[PDB]
CSV table of C-alpha atoms and ligand atoms in Angstrom, one decimal:
chain,number,residue,atom,x,y,z
A,1,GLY,CA,72.0,75.9,207.6
A,2,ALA,CA,68.3,77.3,207.4
A,3,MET,CA,67.3,77.7,210.8
A,4,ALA,CA,64.0,76.2,209.8
A,5,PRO,CA,64.8,74.4,206.7
A,6,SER,CA,61.3,74.6,204.5
A,7,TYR,CA,60.3,73.5,201.1
A,8,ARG,CA,58.3,76.1,198.6
A,9,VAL,CA,57.3,76.2,195.4
A,10,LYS,CA,57.1,79.3,192.9
A,11,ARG,CA,55.6,79.6,189.7
A,12,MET,CA,57.8,81.4,187.7
A,13,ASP,CA,61.4,81.4,185.8
A,14,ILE,CA,63.8,79.8,187.7
A,15,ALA,CA,66.3,82.9,186.3
A,16,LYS,CA,64.4,85.0,188.6
A,17,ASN,CA,65.0,82.9,191.8
A,18,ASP,CA,65.9,84.8,195.1
A,19,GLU,CA,67.8,82.0,196.4
A,20,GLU,CA,71.4,81.5,196.8
A,21,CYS,CA,72.1,78.9,194.1
A,22,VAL,CA,70.4,77.4,191.2
A,23,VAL,CA,70.2,73.8,189.7
A,24,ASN,CA,70.4,73.5,185.7
A,25,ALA,CA,68.2,71.1,184.1
A,26,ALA,CA,71.0,70.6,182.1
A,27,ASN,CA,71.8,68.4,179.1
A,28,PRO,CA,75.5,66.1,179.4
A,29,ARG,CA,77.0,68.0,176.8
A,30,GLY,CA,76.7,71.6,178.5
A,31,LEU,CA,74.4,72.6,175.4
A,32,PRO,CA,72.3,76.0,175.9
A,33,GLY,CA,69.4,73.4,175.3
A,34,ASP,CA,65.6,74.4,175.7
A,35,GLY,CA,63.3,75.3,178.4
A,36,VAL,CA,64.9,75.6,182.1
A,37,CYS,CA,68.3,74.9,180.5
A,38,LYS,CA,68.6,77.8,177.8
A,39,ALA,CA,66.7,80.1,180.6
A,40,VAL,CA,69.6,79.5,182.9
A,41,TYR,CA,71.9,79.6,179.6
A,42,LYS,CA,70.9,83.3,179.0
A,43,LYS,CA,70.9,84.0,183.1
A,44,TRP,CA,74.1,82.7,183.6
A,45,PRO,CA,76.2,81.7,180.2
A,46,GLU,CA,79.7,82.0,182.2
A,47,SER,CA,78.4,78.7,184.2
A,48,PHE,CA,78.7,76.8,181.4
A,49,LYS,CA,82.4,76.7,180.7
A,50,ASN,CA,83.4,72.8,181.2
A,51,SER,CA,79.7,72.1,182.8
A,52,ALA,CA,79.3,69.0,180.2
A,53,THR,CA,79.0,65.9,183.1
A,54,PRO,CA,77.4,62.4,182.5
A,55,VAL,CA,73.7,61.5,182.9
A,56,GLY,CA,73.0,61.1,186.8
A,57,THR,CA,75.3,63.5,188.0
A,58,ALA,CA,75.6,67.4,189.1
A,59,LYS,CA,78.7,69.5,188.4
A,60,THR,CA,78.5,73.0,190.0
A,61,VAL,CA,80.2,76.3,188.1
A,62,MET,CA,80.3,79.7,189.4
A,63,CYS,CA,78.8,82.4,187.5
A,64,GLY,CA,80.9,85.4,189.2
A,65,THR,CA,80.2,83.9,192.9
A,66,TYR,CA,76.5,82.7,192.4
A,67,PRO,CA,76.8,78.6,191.8
A,68,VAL,CA,74.9,76.9,188.6
A,69,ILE,CA,74.8,73.3,189.8
A,70,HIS,CA,73.8,71.6,186.2
A,71,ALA,CA,72.3,68.3,187.1
A,72,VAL,CA,71.7,65.8,184.3
A,73,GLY,CA,68.6,64.1,184.5
A,74,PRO,CA,67.9,61.2,182.1
A,75,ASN,CA,66.1,61.7,178.9
A,76,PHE,CA,63.3,58.7,179.4
A,77,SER,CA,63.0,58.7,175.1
A,78,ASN,CA,66.3,56.7,175.6
A,79,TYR,CA,66.5,55.2,179.0
A,80,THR,CA,64.3,52.0,179.8
A,81,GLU,CA,61.6,53.2,183.0
A,82,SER,CA,63.8,51.2,185.3
A,83,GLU,CA,67.3,52.6,184.4
A,84,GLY,CA,66.0,56.4,184.0
A,85,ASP,CA,64.5,56.1,187.5
A,86,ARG,CA,67.8,54.9,188.7
A,87,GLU,CA,69.5,57.9,187.0
A,88,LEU,CA,67.0,60.5,188.1
A,89,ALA,CA,67.1,59.7,191.8
A,90,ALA,CA,71.4,59.7,191.4
A,91,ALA,CA,71.2,63.2,190.0
A,92,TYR,CA,69.3,64.3,192.9
A,93,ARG,CA,71.8,62.7,195.1
A,94,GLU,CA,74.1,64.6,193.5
A,95,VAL,CA,72.6,67.8,193.8
A,96,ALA,CA,72.2,66.8,197.4
A,97,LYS,CA,76.0,66.6,198.0
A,98,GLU,CA,77.2,69.9,195.7
A,99,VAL,CA,74.1,72.1,198.0
A,100,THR,CA,75.9,70.5,200.9
A,101,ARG,CA,79.8,71.1,200.0
A,102,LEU,CA,78.7,74.7,198.9
A,103,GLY,CA,77.3,75.4,202.2
A,104,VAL,CA,74.5,77.8,201.0
A,105,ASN,CA,71.5,78.1,203.0
A,106,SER,CA,68.8,78.2,199.9
A,107,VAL,CA,68.6,76.5,196.7
A,108,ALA,CA,66.3,76.9,193.6
A,109,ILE,CA,65.5,73.6,192.0
A,110,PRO,CA,63.4,72.9,188.9
A,111,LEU,CA,61.8,69.3,188.6
A,112,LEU,CA,64.5,67.2,186.7
A,113,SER,CA,63.4,64.9,183.6
A,114,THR,CA,59.8,66.2,183.8
A,115,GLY,CA,59.7,68.4,180.3
A,116,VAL,CA,61.5,67.1,177.3
A,117,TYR,CA,63.0,64.6,179.0
A,118,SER,CA,59.8,62.8,180.4
A,119,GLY,CA,59.4,60.8,177.3
A,120,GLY,CA,55.8,62.3,177.0
A,121,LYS,CA,54.7,61.0,180.8
A,122,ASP,CA,53.6,62.8,183.6
A,123,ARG,CA,56.5,62.4,186.1
A,124,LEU,CA,55.6,65.3,189.0
A,125,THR,CA,55.1,62.6,191.3
A,126,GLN,CA,58.7,60.5,190.4
A,127,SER,CA,60.5,63.5,190.2
A,128,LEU,CA,59.3,65.2,193.3
A,129,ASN,CA,59.8,62.3,195.2
A,130,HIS,CA,63.0,61.8,194.4
A,131,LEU,CA,64.1,65.4,195.0
A,132,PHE,CA,62.8,64.9,198.8
A,133,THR,CA,64.6,61.6,199.0
A,134,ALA,CA,67.7,63.6,198.1
A,135,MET,CA,67.4,66.9,199.6
A,136,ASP,CA,65.4,65.8,203.1
A,137,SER,CA,68.6,65.3,204.9
A,138,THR,CA,70.0,68.7,203.6
A,139,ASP,CA,69.2,71.9,205.9
A,140,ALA,CA,69.2,74.4,203.0
A,141,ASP,CA,65.9,76.0,202.1
A,142,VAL,CA,64.4,74.5,199.0
A,143,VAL,CA,62.5,76.3,196.5
A,144,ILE,CA,60.7,74.6,193.5
A,145,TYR,CA,60.2,76.4,190.7
A,146,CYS,CA,57.5,75.5,188.0
A,147,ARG,CA,55.4,76.9,185.0
A,148,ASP,CA,52.2,74.9,185.1
A,149,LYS,CA,49.7,76.3,187.2
A,150,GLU,CA,48.1,72.7,188.1
A,151,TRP,CA,51.8,71.6,189.0
A,152,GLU,CA,52.2,74.1,191.4
A,153,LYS,CA,48.7,73.0,193.4
A,154,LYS,CA,50.2,69.7,193.0
A,155,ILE,CA,53.7,70.2,194.2
A,156,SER,CA,51.9,72.8,197.3
A,157,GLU,CA,49.8,69.9,197.9
A,158,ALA,CA,52.8,67.3,198.3
A,159,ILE,CA,54.9,69.7,200.8
A,160,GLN,CA,52.1,70.9,202.9
A,161,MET,CA,50.8,67.0,203.4
A,162,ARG,CA,54.2,66.0,204.6
A,163,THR,CA,54.5,69.1,207.3
B,1,LIG,C1,56.1,67.3,179.5
B,1,LIG,C2,54.7,67.5,179.4
B,1,LIG,C3,54.1,67.3,178.1
B,1,LIG,C4,54.1,66.2,177.4
B,1,LIG,C5,52.8,65.0,178.6
B,1,LIG,C6,54.0,65.4,179.9
B,1,LIG,N1,53.9,66.8,180.3
B,1,LIG,C7,53.2,67.0,181.5
B,1,LIG,O1,52.5,66.0,182.1
B,1,LIG,C8,53.7,68.3,182.1
B,1,LIG,C9,55.3,68.6,182.2
B,1,LIG,N2,55.4,69.8,183.0
B,1,LIG,C10,54.5,70.7,183.2
B,1,LIG,C11,53.2,70.3,182.9
B,1,LIG,N3,52.7,69.2,182.5
B,2,CL,CL1,58.3,84.5,185.0
B,3,CL,CL1,63.3,68.3,181.1
């Protein structure tokens, strides 16, 4: 565990993270995909051997000894708001199980279903709150990666609000 488990946010490419493992915003087919998933594929392509897993699940594949937790958020283009909300919360619960099982002291994590799976809606608060619901009972340091300057501020505010 971390001595004083924290949440932090950084605005940069999660492929450059300084944590003991990474969460991929994966597709269910284990394809290279786009956005975070493509960055992860370029940095850790070995981790896509048999990474395919259903929506709402996480499957970890090692790249060397570096764990890549492939977490499949729902595509809100395809799901109802109700069903997509349930699967998004479920994917984060599976991430917390994997982080715990791996025994890491830190994890780099993107906000699932906030990019091309968002159905064109702003889901920062929805996705971040499901992240907190899942990760709050873990003792790993969590570092959230984003790319948008306004999202960095909003994520940082939500972290600081609870301290
Ligand atoms: C998926 C995007 C684009 C479509 C509208 C919804 N949307 C955002 O609000 C957003 C997400 N992530 C970072 C910055 N903005
Ligand atoms: Cl960067
Ligand atoms: Cl996404």
